[PDB]
Amino acid sequence: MDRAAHAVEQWRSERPDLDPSSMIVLGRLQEAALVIARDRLNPLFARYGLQPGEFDVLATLRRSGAPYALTPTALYDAAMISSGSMTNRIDRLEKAGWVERRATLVALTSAGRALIDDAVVAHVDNQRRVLSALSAAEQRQLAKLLDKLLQGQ
């Protein structure tokens, strides 16, 4: 029994008037996102000098194609994750030398392009090791259920 199943068990015993079934799927969803970010993905980003969220900025710029420059709005719309503090992240990346602000565009530098080209290869190998417990069918199955849940919001 994991955190979520144990908690549901305690709730059934303590508040029998309650149907706490929904707590398992949502508790596991949030714990999986947290543990994977904290223990797997972010330590790899930090090996590359990237704080959480900064990889996404560079990745979005890189995969938009040459000249790897987007408006801050397009950067938010094309991000993998709709996380905030985008102005702070661009500022940090600029002082680090990986993006520059042109005209108003945010663009990879040569150094930033080189970094993300390196980091994305390490990132996808890391992701496959994160998902290796699930078979290919289970991974597609999990992607489909997550897409339905997301659209339901």
Next chain:
Amino acid sequence: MDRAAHAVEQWRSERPDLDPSSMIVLGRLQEAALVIARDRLNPLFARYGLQPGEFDVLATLRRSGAPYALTPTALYDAAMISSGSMTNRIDRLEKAGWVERRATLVALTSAGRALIDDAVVAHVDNQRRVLSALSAAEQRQLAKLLDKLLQGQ
């Protein structure tokens, strides 16, 4: 196409040397956790005066049973989510009048017990509305895949 599928499409076109398939399931996992916390669960907690993470503390204490008092270590082990800043959350909850520090235990006050008894009922109704796009079988299916992924870590 969602954020994740669109990003994978751009990657296949820009770095054909890369297999970016893993990005869909993990991108959807993190976006679903984020959107559900930000747009669904946390606004409900804030209706009750609870910041993100504080509900979990009260919920853990309440479901441990009378006298609703745990060591800070037990509080971390029994939490639904292994999130940090537990000392800060206990401090906040203490100044708010919902927990007290006894002997070293953290315990619900009368006011804190009443609050969590009210909030947990609202919380589970909110969770069912969050999950309503998925059928009962899909929800169990999603809980099983998430459990396998978590154990794989």
